[PDB]
């Protein structure tokens with residue numbers, strides 16, 4: 001029964017920085033179709049990536065900005081996790097591609113897919129790896145090129161999804177910066193948000209329709225609005241923080257009315273800042289939460305060290321939540 | 329500034345069991361390779377491999393492997409707090425497979441995500457699961473490598489038609505009396521991402537689906553050279569991290585990519601003459617993320633390895649990615 005070593009890393013880990021990338025093309029409600037969109041969803045405009053851009057290329061840019069904001073270079077990073085739904089290759093994964101693009105072609109890394117909640121899972125996994133001693137400093141980047149997956153004839157969701165990327169640096173902090181991860185799924189509602197035709201079935205029958213994103217609105221709305229408050233409470237309990245201590249709330253930027261209901265259910269202070277990046281960023285799935293954090297810090301709405309509650313929710317029916325201290 | 333709480337989990341974690349699902353369709357070298365009518369065997373060690381049915385998926389096979397893993401641990405779905413699915417052949421951008429897998433086992437509600445790191449998916453997934461359990465995020469998890477690679481194969485690709493295959497195998501990861509999973513050794517060579525790849529991205533394809541379709545492409549010489557050059561060091565780093573010597577390893581479970589690579593690695597790692605070396609590749613081929621746990625499953629089934637034998641795992645593949653650890657054999 002030979003000894004296998006037990007190891008550990010730094011106990012206190014937090015967000016050292018965030019960097020964000022949004023593509024340049026402003027897309028209006030009048031272009032992604034064929035008066036009440038803003039009212040119903042909270043969206044006015046979104047950003048679409050260029051043809052030559054990819055989830056991977058945007059991840060690279062966000063990571064560059066996150067390193068710069070941390071006072072770090074790529075040689076300081078031990079690992080990278082890319083989280084996404086729009087890396088349109090079965091292999092290779094985007095993480096080593098990003099690693100090489102940053103000039104650290106040899107560092108560990110993998111891709112994490114958990115629908116919209118990928119970021120919360122990816123954060124928790126980096127936190128755990130570092131505390132476990134598998135790394136000291138990591139990049140976690142949510143990146144999405146959703147624009148090509150949208151059926152422009154589907155008024156059900158055509159105005160929802162968008163493009164962009166955002167990265168956080170995660171590493172040793174003087175005090176705990178990332179609370180315990182509260183996560184879960186509802187695999188019985190896997191169909192509620194989906195690619196409608198798998199790629200192989202499509203490739204094997206090219207005379208058929210191509211795949212696009214499909215959404216089941218009432219079922220999604222119902223689930224989020226009514227279960228996400230209890231998830232938020234578990235995240236606050238686990239972190240040992242009270243609802244009234246939360247300065248910033250970053251729900252997934254999926255729909256404004258869902259997020260409005262959550263705020264009331266969660267019993268946060270009246271002055272708690274609630275992320276509304278959705279209005280000019282739309283729904284950027286895995287990139288949503290860190291894009292919203294960056295946006296709040298940019299505008300002055302949040303400050304480094306603010307207590308933020310993050311709740312990711314979406315496809316698979318997956319959610320991941322945690323309390324953090326704001327970076328930068 | 330009030331301080332954020334931390335949680336804690338098990339210190340000592342291990343592979344409690346393995347469960348293996350192999351689809352029933354047996355495929356010979358003749359059938360998958362247009363160019364061949366015995367050298368494929370000599371050059372790679374592959375004689376046959378299993379192909380999933382048309383109706384089967386990476387997700388469906390994962391469920392089956394999970395059921396078997398649970399039964400092999402004497403546990404139920406009630407005992408699992410998390411599932412990581414690792415694959416390269418879940419052919420949906422969304423939804424992920426992990427939640428539908430969890431539902432399939434009656435553990436709807438439980439956390440889960442999919443992990444992709446080419447062939448090295450399993451080692452990263454095993455590493456991630458151990459980390460999560462020690463961090464207090466879960467107490468007992470399923471980690472399942474699953475692959476339906478058969479429909480990605482170009483039967484005219486003389487360099488790779490014979491390589492890839494279907495299967496799934498899961499491990500139950502949980503608290504043990506003594507440390508059962510050593511630290512994770514991992515890394516990449518992102519500058520060689522094109523070495524193993526889908527050749528046409530899905531969106532580029534979606535715009536011209538009546539033209540050429542995507543298939544798996546592999547630059548074999550490049551991959552052979554890199555594995556033979558690099559994996560010895562990788563193996564040594566995993567043993568060093570676990571605090572073990574080469575002569576202490578009982579079972580060597582390298583990725584089932586090519587038998588000749590794996591022989592070169594045995595010699596390079598300086599393992600014991602009598603160290604048991606995984607050769608599941610012979611009738612299973614390269615099942616990517618399912619390879620290591622399927623190979624563990626095979627050594628146990630044949631009784632070539634026993635539960636508790638000290639094992640060295642090395643995964644290597646696309647991305648150019650690798651992930652390694654010393655573990656005790658499950659079952």
Ligand SMILES: *SCCCCCCCCCC
Pocket residue numbers: 085086115116117148149193194195196211212213214285286313314315421422
């Ligand atoms: S909440 C996550 C939504 C992500 C959707 C991925 C795109 C699916 C359509 C592929 C054509």
Ligand SMILES: *SCCCCCCCCCC
Pocket residue numbers: 090091416417446447448480524525526527542543544545616644645646
């Ligand atoms: S070593 C990892 C091999 C994974 C191959 C995934 C399939 C890519 C081609 C899809 C058409």
